[PDB]
Design a protein around this ligand. Structure first.
Ligand SMILES: O=C(O)c1ccc(-c2ccccc2)s1
Length: 259
């Protein structure tokens, strides 16, 4: 009947509980993954059966409100969510993805497709805040969960919804994609902090697609051409090989490889 579900709560959340959570999310994302090379490759969307296409992340907080994000296993990204008897989806990019999401939350009474996609450029626009001025941590996540829930009752305004997506996507999807970003979150939880992401986190997130390409197209682990990233202080540097990123990137979107 149902896609795999991972549960997380911000209520009493620890370094350990967040760690177990991201571990479980990666576990479900990589059931069908190619794990025979240096970095796990998520399943190819082409030909992937619909019953293997999604996982669900059920989030709860101190207020014991609950929402369920749907993640696409082919890119680890949030495609939509359920709150109560309503489901809300980002605008799909093509007809195959639109058809795919009709298989999610099939029991809800109310289904809605937003006009907008879930990319950061658009979400930041809707939120009126760049990622660099949106705080991440257990506090922001707790508040994002309530805001997501109350969207369904008319009690959350759309800019707050968008900000809340930005928080959730980074703390769940990007943390699953990158050990580096998981560590950034882990440190926030460890010292009970909330703070916006530094440029290293932001450019990793921006570069995930291109890194996945450069890695899977590489020859003897060597990139066809460098990819520029940023340190935490904003300074730039280049990456030329796959091995140096094994500790940094945990998962990759399927990419084809050269002749
Ligand atoms: O001192 C620093 O801030 C850093 C050193 C290396 C960093 C990094 C960032 C993204 C990917 C791989 C390494 S950040």
């Amino acid at each position: 009947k149902q896609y795999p579900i991972i549960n997380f709560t911000t209520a009493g959340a620890t370094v350990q509980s967040y760690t177990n959570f991201i571990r479980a999310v990666r576990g479900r994302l990589t059931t069908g993954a190619d794990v025979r090379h240096e970095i796990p490759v998520l399943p190819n969307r082409v030909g992937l059966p619909i019953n293997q296409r999604f996982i669900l992340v059920e989030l709860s907080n101190h207020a014991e409100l609950s929402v369920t994000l749907a993640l696409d296993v082919t890119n680890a990204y949030v495609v939509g969510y359920r709150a109560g008897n309503s489901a809300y989806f980002f605008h799909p990019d093509n007809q195959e993805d639109a058809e795919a999401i009709t298989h999610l939350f099939t029991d809800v009474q109310n289904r809605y497709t937003f006009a907008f996609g879930g990319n950061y450029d658009r979400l930041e626009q809707l939120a009126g805040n760049l990622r660099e001025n949106i705080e991440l941590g257990n506090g922001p996540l707790e508040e994002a969960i309530s805001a997501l829930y109350y969207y369904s009752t008319g009690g959350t305004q759309l800019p707050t919804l968008a900000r809340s997506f930005i928080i959730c996507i980074q703390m769940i999807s990007e943390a699953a994609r990158f050990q580096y970003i998981e560590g950034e979150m882990r440190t926030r939880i460890r010292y009970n902090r909330r703070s916006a992401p530094d440029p290293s986190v932001i450019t990793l997130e921006n570069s995930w697609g291109r890194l996945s390409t450069a890695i899977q197209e590489s020859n003897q682990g060597a990139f066809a051409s460098p990819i520029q990233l940023q340190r935490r202080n904003g300074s730039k540097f280049s990456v030329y090989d796959v091995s140096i990123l094994i500790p940094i990137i945990a998962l990759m979107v399927y990419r084809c490889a050269p002749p």
